[PDB]
Design a protein around this ligand. Structure first.
Ligand SMILES: *[C@@H]1O[C@H](CO)[C@@H](O[C@@H]2O[C@H](CO)[C@@H](O[C@@H]3O[C@H](CO)[C@@H](O)[C@H](O[C@H]4O[C@H](CO)[C@@H](O)[C@H](O)[C@@H]4O[C@H]4O[C@H](CO)[C@@H](O)[C@H](O)[C@@H]4O)[C@@H]3O)[C@H](O)[C@H]2NC(C)=O)[C@H](O)[C@H]1NC(C)=O
Ligand SMILES: *[C@@H]1O[C@H](CO)[C@@H](O[C@@H]2O[C@H](CO)[C@@H](O)[C@H](O)[C@H]2NC(C)=O)[C@H](O)[C@H]1NC(C)=O
Ligand SMILES: *[C@@H]1O[C@H](CO)[C@@H](O[C@@H]2O[C@H](CO)[C@@H](O)[C@H](O)[C@H]2NC(C)=O)[C@H](O)[C@H]1NC(C)=O
Ligand SMILES: *[C@@H]1O[C@H](CO)[C@@H](O[C@@H]2O[C@H](CO)[C@@H](O)[C@H](O)[C@H]2NC(C)=O)[C@H](O)[C@H]1NC(C)=O
Ligand SMILES: *[C@@H]1O[C@H](CO)[C@@H](O[C@@H]2O[C@H](CO)[C@@H](O)[C@H](O)[C@H]2NC(C)=O)[C@H](O)[C@H]1NC(C)=O
Ligand SMILES: *[C@@H]1O[C@H](CO)[C@@H](O[C@@H]2O[C@H](CO)[C@@H](O)[C@H](O)[C@H]2NC(C)=O)[C@H](O)[C@H]1NC(C)=O
Ligand SMILES: *[C@@H]1O[C@H](CO)[C@@H](O[C@@H]2O[C@H](CO)[C@@H](O)[C@H](O)[C@H]2NC(C)=O)[C@H](O)[C@H]1NC(C)=O
Ligand SMILES: *[C@@H]1O[C@H](CO)[C@@H](O[C@@H]2O[C@H](CO)[C@@H](O)[C@H](O)[C@H]2NC(C)=O)[C@H](O)[C@H]1NC(C)=O
Ligand SMILES: *[C@@H]1O[C@H](CO)[C@@H](O[C@@H]2O[C@H](CO)[C@@H](O)[C@H](O)[C@H]2NC(C)=O)[C@H](O)[C@H]1NC(C)=O
Ligand SMILES: *[C@@H]1O[C@H](CO)[C@@H](O[C@@H]2O[C@H](CO)[C@@H](O)[C@H](O)[C@H]2NC(C)=O)[C@H](O)[C@H]1NC(C)=O
Ligand SMILES: *[C@@H]1O[C@H](CO)[C@@H](O[C@@H]2O[C@H](CO)[C@@H](O)[C@H](O)[C@H]2NC(C)=O)[C@H](O)[C@H]1NC(C)=O
Ligand SMILES: *[C@@H]1O[C@H](CO)[C@@H](O[C@@H]2O[C@H](CO)[C@@H](O)[C@H](O)[C@H]2NC(C)=O)[C@H](O)[C@H]1NC(C)=O
Ligand SMILES: *[C@@H]1O[C@H](CO)[C@@H](O[C@@H]2O[C@H](CO)[C@@H](O)[C@H](O)[C@H]2NC(C)=O)[C@H](O)[C@H]1NC(C)=O
Ligand SMILES: *[C@@H]1O[C@H](CO)[C@@H](O)[C@H](O)[C@H]1NC(C)=O
Ligand SMILES: *[C@@H]1O[C@H](CO)[C@@H](O)[C@H](O)[C@H]1NC(C)=O
Ligand SMILES: *[C@@H]1O[C@H](CO)[C@@H](O)[C@H](O)[C@H]1NC(C)=O
Ligand SMILES: *[C@@H]1O[C@H](CO)[C@@H](O)[C@H](O)[C@H]1NC(C)=O
Ligand SMILES: *[C@@H]1O[C@H](CO)[C@@H](O)[C@H](O)[C@H]1NC(C)=O
Ligand SMILES: *[C@@H]1O[C@H](CO)[C@@H](O)[C@H](O)[C@H]1NC(C)=O
Ligand SMILES: *[C@@H]1O[C@H](CO)[C@@H](O)[C@H](O)[C@H]1NC(C)=O
Lengths: 441, 48, 48
């Protein structure tokens, strides 16, 4: 009585969750855009009416691919660069004590060593200023990396400044974007659109603080895979940025040492003037009221009369226990103990100064046996950044006590990438469909 | 028995068994390996 | 250059001259230091 027959429709708007390889788009630098397609001057966003889509930022394969891409770009930017195998020699080091403050004592070593020249049968006695964090005593020292691997000097012309990178789906795939503000990254997004490329995401490498990122448009956003599991990192996104001013004030002198035919090692010559500590400044009132916002949003998950406490990082590597970042070629590791030091009970112009230590021997990603040497930067260096979020870790939390304690976390850059890709997902279009219709062929 | 040209003695004969023959091969020495650092992150494994 | 002697401690009659106890200077992790090390090599692996 129905008299219904199979009918094939091609071009149907249906999609499935898919994993594919996205490609790069962008408008000397590590984040190589010489292999990235030009971005469209007028990108097209298609706002999908009535589409309620399932999103999950914690299983997003875009994050994994982007992590791989960033690591590969870092690796290939270091390949045509000087391998500092000759630098693994015995160093004769003394203390730098000419115009140092009390907090820079023992932090710099004046190390003389024998080095190869362009002629295979000649040696040169040279010297360099090294950081206490980069040398280990055997008055005789060696570079920290020399019992693990040889180090590759970063090519001085290559810039470390992040450039925005757009991620685009290939043919047959679409990037679905969640336009829902107040979205916490997991569950159904009822306001969905389609984009051919993601927005410009800067590969900002940092720990304990997300810098130069995107802000929430409504209020501070708390995002955890499982908020009641204290082994899961909490990602905090600010609605208003916090300005952080980081300086290395030393007037550094770079000298170039010919260690082989066409091979230069860039040593630190001598600091012109006073030697004093690198640091970062954060506005005290801005940070205080931002933490008030974070506390008000954490109470929604951890009780309305609970005590919310911020404390120091527990321990581990210097990368994870400090706000570690990169300020114009130099690698800072700042003690964020004045930031996360407070308790919150339910009921001017000064600033917080975070002392920072510089390093030249860098292990960027959580890898061992693959290290990078940062050449010294000529002159004083100063940068200004926006803190747009936090990576926190909740402490213990048994039912014994009513105080919740949060400590800065980080180390894994996938959480940094997840804070920008939380509202994106990749799907593959399924154009073929079969339906009942009255026609017969 | 499989040969490309059985009457050409320059061709190898491939024999395939229907029943395997068990062969037991041992090096009976209790060898000691020591590791020698020959460079940064470079080990040579000597017999101790 | 390897300075080799015969391994003769608890060898059978068919292992005579088969193992060489060779001492040599080798590089270290530091470019300006040398280490005197030794290794056991096989007669088939060394040539005088
Ligand atoms: C968050 O974003 C902010 C803003 O975008 C970032 O702050 C900016 O950071 C950039 C890069 O660090 C900085 O630009 C530098 O400004 C300096 C002062 O004007 C310049 O001297 C410097 O140019 C030198 O370096 C470039 C590569 O970095 C070279 O291309 C250039 O030729 C210069 O290099 C010459 O000089 C040096 C020094 O003598 C020498 O070593 C070289 O061999 C060569 O001779 C950059 O242009 C901005 O000024 C910053 N802006 C502000 C407002 O602070 C911030 O860093 C971001 N945060 C994070 C964590 O990424
Ligand atoms: C690091 O040590 C070197 C060598 O000891 C210092 O260079 C010497 O500086 C004095 C003047 O202060 C000169 O008279 C010598 O000729 C220099 N020696 C060499 C080999 O160049 C250098 O000043 C020291 N730097 C610091 C910051 O302590
Ligand atoms: C650079 O090399 C020279 C020579 O190779 C070193 O001087 C020697 O030092 C040793 C002590 O370790 C003495 O026994 C020698 O007599 C010295 N020789 C000469 C010619 O002076 C020198 O110490 C090395 N310099 C550095 C900074 O390592
Ligand atoms: C820090 O944050 C401020 C505020 O978000 C940024 O200033 C904005 O910059 C955008 C450019 O994309 C402008 O469209 C806005 O109008 C600016 N707003 C204000 C209040 O100035 C600033 O660029 C950020 N700085 C860094 C280094 O990221
Ligand atoms: C969040 O993670 C916790 C893990 O601590 C999950 O709950 C635990 O599950 C184990 C499984 O045997 C139990 O032994 C624990 O007693 C549980 N913890 C508590 C406090 O009861 C929890 O299921 C996770 N949440 C979600 C939504 O997956
Ligand atoms: C961080 O804040 C300190 C103040 O606690 C700044 O130190 C001042 O720097 C200015 C430079 O213009 C001097 O005029 C003042 O005399 C300094 N005062 C003190 C007490 O040191 C420091 O310069 C700030 N650094 C950054 C990068 O903002
Ligand atoms: C970080 O540095 C910026 C400038 O790079 C500071 O902005 C200045 O703020 C004062 C207020 O105390 C104003 O009078 C100036 O006009 C601002 N300068 C500029 C160029 O905008 C900012 O105060 C610094 N923040 C901290 C925490 O030190
Ligand atoms: C967080 O604060 C504690 C104490 O406020 C720091 O503990 C100090 O660690 C240094 C390093 O050896 C010791 O010399 C001090 O004596 C410790 N202070 C106290 C009061 O015990 C801790 O280092 C801070 N966290 C980080 C990551 O620096
Ligand atoms: C981060 O800063 C805190 C605050 O200065 C450091 O804790 C101080 O440590 C010194 C020891 O060098 C003590 O004399 C102070 O009394 C401590 N102050 C406080 C408030 O605890 C802490 O050690 C720093 N972190 C690191 C890794 O050095
Ligand atoms: C197998 O190999 C034999 C030897 O190469 C081939 O026979 C020879 O062929 C040459 C060709 O000029 C003659 O001069 C010889 O007199 C032959 N000898 C014999 C014993 O036949 C033979 O043709 C090959 N078989 C096949 C099937 O290719
Ligand atoms: C090869 O055969 C010889 C004997 O011809 C084996 O030597 C015997 O090894 C067993 C080990 O269980 C001893 O108990 C005997 O006393 C040995 N006899 C002799 C004469 O040496 C040898 O172990 C065999 N090797 C393998 C790999 O099978
Ligand atoms: C290979 O030669 C080395 C060096 O002659 C031997 O090592 C020596 O062993 C004796 C005891 O047998 C020790 O007293 C020496 O101190 C050792 N010297 C060194 C440099 O380690 C080794 O025993 C020999 N091995 C064989 C199998 O002949
Ligand atoms: C390791 O090197 C040392 C020195 O480089 C060698 O000892 C030298 O041997 C020569 C003979 O070839 C003598 O003329 C020298 O006087 C020796 N110098 C010293 C300091 O002893 C030694 O023979 C080498 N060892 C090996 C195993 O090759
Ligand atoms: C260098 O200075 C530190 C701190 O002032 C001191 O502990 C160390 O012994 C000094 N080393 C020298 C003088 O060789
Ligand atoms: C290298 O030396 C440091 C300190 O001397 C030590 O902690 C580390 O374990 C060493 N690494 C290796 C691979 O031996
Ligand atoms: C916030 O995240 C939790 C995680 O379990 C999810 O259940 C909830 O739906 C999210 N919020 C909204 C408004 O969907
Ligand atoms: C650093 O030193 C050089 C050379 O002495 C000088 O020309 C320059 O002005 C100095 N820079 C600062 C910021 O003091
Ligand atoms: C942490 O706060 C206490 C006030 O309770 C203060 O005494 C201490 O100096 C602070 N620590 C830092 C590193 O600012
Ligand atoms: C080889 O020597 C080691 C160390 O003396 C010993 O523990 C082990 O049991 C020996 N193996 C055999 C098969 O004799
Ligand atoms: C080592 O032993 C073999 C066989 O026993 C002998 O021919 C050779 O001369 C020996 N070499 C020495 C003692 O240097």
């Amino acid at each position: 009585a129905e008299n219904l027959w199979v009918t094939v429709y091609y071009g149907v708007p249906v999609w499935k969750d898919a994993e594919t390889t996205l490609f790069c788009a962008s408008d000397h630098n590590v984040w190589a855009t010489h292999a990235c397609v030009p971005t469209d001057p007028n990108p097209q966003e298609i706002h999908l009416e009535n589409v309620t889509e399932e999103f999950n930022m914690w299983k997003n394969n875009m994050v994994e691919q982007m992590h791989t891409d960033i690591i590969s770009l870092w690796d290939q930017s270091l390949k045509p660069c000087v391998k500092l195998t000759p630098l693994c020699v015995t160093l004769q080091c003394t203390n730098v004590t000419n115009n140092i403050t009390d907090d820079m004592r023992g932090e710099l070593k004046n190390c003389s060593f024998n080095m190869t020249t362009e002629l295979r049968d000649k040696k040169q006695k040279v010297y360099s200023l090294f950081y206490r964090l980069d040398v280990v005593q055997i008055k005789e020292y060696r570079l920290i990396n020399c019992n693990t691997s040889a180090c590759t000097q970063a090519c001085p012309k290559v810039s470390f400044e992040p450039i925005p990178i757009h991620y685009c789906a290939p043919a047959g795939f679409a990037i679905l974007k969640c336009k829902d503000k107040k979205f916490n990254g997991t569950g159904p997004c009822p306001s969905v659109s389609t984009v051919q490329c993601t927005h410009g995401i800067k590969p900002v490498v940092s720990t304990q603080l997300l810098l130069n990122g995107s802000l929430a448009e409504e209020e501070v956003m708390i995002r955890s895979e499982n908020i009641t599991n204290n082994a899961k990192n909490i990602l905090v996104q600010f609605n208003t940025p916090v300005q952080i001013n980081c300086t290395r004030p030393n007037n550094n002198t770079r000298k170039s040492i010919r260690i082989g035919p066409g091979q230069a090692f860039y040593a630190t010559g001598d600091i012109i003037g006073d030697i004093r500590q690198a640091h970062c400044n954060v506005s005290k009132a801005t940070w205080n009221e931002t933490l008030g916002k974070v506390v008000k949003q954490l109470r929604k998950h951890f009780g309305n009369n609970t005590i919310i406490r911020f404390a120091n990082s527990s321990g581990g590597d210097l990368e994870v226990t400090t706000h570690s970042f990169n300020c114009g070629g130099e690698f800072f590791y700042c003690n964020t103990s004045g930031l996360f030091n407070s308790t919150w009970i339910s009921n001017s112009n000064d600033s917080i100064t975070l002392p920072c230590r510089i390093k030249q021997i860098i292990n960027m990603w959580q890898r061992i046996g693959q290290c990078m040497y940062a050449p010294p930067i000529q002159g004083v260096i100063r940068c200004v950044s926006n803190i747009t979020g936090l990576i926190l870790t909740r402490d213990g939390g048994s039912t014994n006590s009513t105080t919740e304690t949060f400590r800065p976390g980080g180390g894994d850059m996938r959480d940094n990438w997840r804070s920008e890709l939380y509202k994106y997902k990749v799907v593959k279009i399924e154009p073929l469909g079969v339906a009942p219709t009255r026609c017969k062929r």
